[PDB]
Design an enzyme around this catalytic site. Structure first.
Site, PDB file in Angstrom:
ATOM      1  N   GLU A  55       3.792  -2.072   7.058  1.00  0.00           N
ATOM      2  CA  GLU A  55       4.251  -2.089   8.459  1.00  0.00           C
ATOM      3  C   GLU A  55       5.200  -3.214   8.802  1.00  0.00           C
ATOM      4  O   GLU A  55       5.145  -4.280   8.201  1.00  0.00           O
ATOM      5  CB  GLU A  55       3.046  -2.084   9.407  1.00  0.00           C
ATOM      6  CG  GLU A  55       2.127  -3.262   9.327  1.00  0.00           C
ATOM      7  CD  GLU A  55       2.647  -4.560   9.898  1.00  0.00           C
ATOM      8  OE1 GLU A  55       2.312  -5.627   9.316  1.00  0.00           O
ATOM      9  OE2 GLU A  55       3.411  -4.582  10.879  1.00  0.00           O
ATOM     10  N   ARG A  66       4.490 -10.078  20.601  1.00  0.00           N
ATOM     11  CA  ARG A  66       4.968  -9.245  19.502  1.00  0.00           C
ATOM     12  C   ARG A  66       5.057  -7.739  19.876  1.00  0.00           C
ATOM     13  O   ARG A  66       5.996  -7.031  19.493  1.00  0.00           O
ATOM     14  CB  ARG A  66       4.034  -9.429  18.340  1.00  0.00           C
ATOM     15  CG  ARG A  66       4.283  -8.611  17.140  1.00  0.00           C
ATOM     16  CD  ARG A  66       3.809  -9.290  15.865  1.00  0.00           C
ATOM     17  NE  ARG A  66       3.979  -8.374  14.729  1.00  0.00           N
ATOM     18  CZ  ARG A  66       3.017  -7.847  13.972  1.00  0.00           C
ATOM     19  NH1 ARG A  66       1.741  -8.167  14.175  1.00  0.00           N
ATOM     20  NH2 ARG A  66       3.357  -6.984  12.975  1.00  0.00           N
ATOM     21  N   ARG A  70       6.192  -0.256  16.005  1.00  0.00           N
ATOM     22  CA  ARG A  70       6.141  -0.453  14.544  1.00  0.00           C
ATOM     23  C   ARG A  70       6.925   0.610  13.802  1.00  0.00           C
ATOM     24  O   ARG A  70       7.025   1.744  14.211  1.00  0.00           O
ATOM     25  CB  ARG A  70       4.683  -0.416  14.054  1.00  0.00           C
ATOM     26  CG  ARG A  70       3.722  -1.439  14.594  1.00  0.00           C
ATOM     27  CD  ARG A  70       3.985  -2.788  14.016  1.00  0.00           C
ATOM     28  NE  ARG A  70       2.985  -3.772  14.452  1.00  0.00           N
ATOM     29  CZ  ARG A  70       2.986  -4.406  15.633  1.00  0.00           C
ATOM     30  NH1 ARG A  70       3.958  -4.256  16.481  1.00  0.00           N
ATOM     31  NH2 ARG A  70       2.021  -5.285  15.914  1.00  0.00           N
ATOM     32  N   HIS A  85       1.055   0.977  18.026  1.00  0.00           N
ATOM     33  CA  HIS A  85       0.213   0.305  17.054  1.00  0.00           C
ATOM     34  C   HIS A  85      -0.664   1.309  16.381  1.00  0.00           C
ATOM     35  O   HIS A  85      -1.936   1.157  16.278  1.00  0.00           O
ATOM     36  CB  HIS A  85      -0.586  -0.789  17.733  1.00  0.00           C
ATOM     37  CG  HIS A  85      -1.095  -1.819  16.793  1.00  0.00           C
ATOM     38  ND1 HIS A  85      -2.366  -1.774  16.266  1.00  0.00           N
ATOM     39  CD2 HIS A  85      -0.507  -2.929  16.287  1.00  0.00           C
ATOM     40  CE1 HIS A  85      -2.537  -2.828  15.482  1.00  0.00           C
ATOM     41  NE2 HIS A  85      -1.422  -3.537  15.481  1.00  0.00           N
TER      42      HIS A  85
END
EC number: 3.1.4.8
Length: 96
Positions: A55, A66, A70, A85
């Protein structure tokens, strides 16, 4: 293995495309956790051997966090998008 939508690479967020380009360059990456194994524990991606998937963060200006977005790569250069996520995946179509 389960149902994944396709998404055209060009239709992804700019930042997602940025991540794909950084992956292609082998970084350097912005986060320490970029490139960590993704274990695919929910079998949302095709079931493969240990360490098949990795990832990478897709940057979210959204805050200082953050964030949740992804890209996940596979061992033969498969690319998947997940804005959440790993709750959901789409297969990135490198052709469009």
């Amino acid at each position: 293995d389960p149902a994944l939508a396709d998404v055209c690479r060009t239709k992804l967020p700019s930042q997602a495309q940025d991540t794909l380009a950084l992956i292609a360059k082998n970084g350097p990456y912005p986060y320490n956790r970029d490139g960590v194994v993704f274990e695919n524990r929910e079998s949302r991606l095709p079931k493969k051997g240990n360490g098949y998937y990795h990832e990478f963060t897709v940057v979210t200006p959204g805050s200082n966090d953050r964030g949740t977005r992804r890209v996940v790569t596979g061992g033969y250069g498969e690319q998947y998008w997940s804005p959440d996520h790993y709750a959901t995946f789409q297969e990135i179509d490198p052709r469009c």
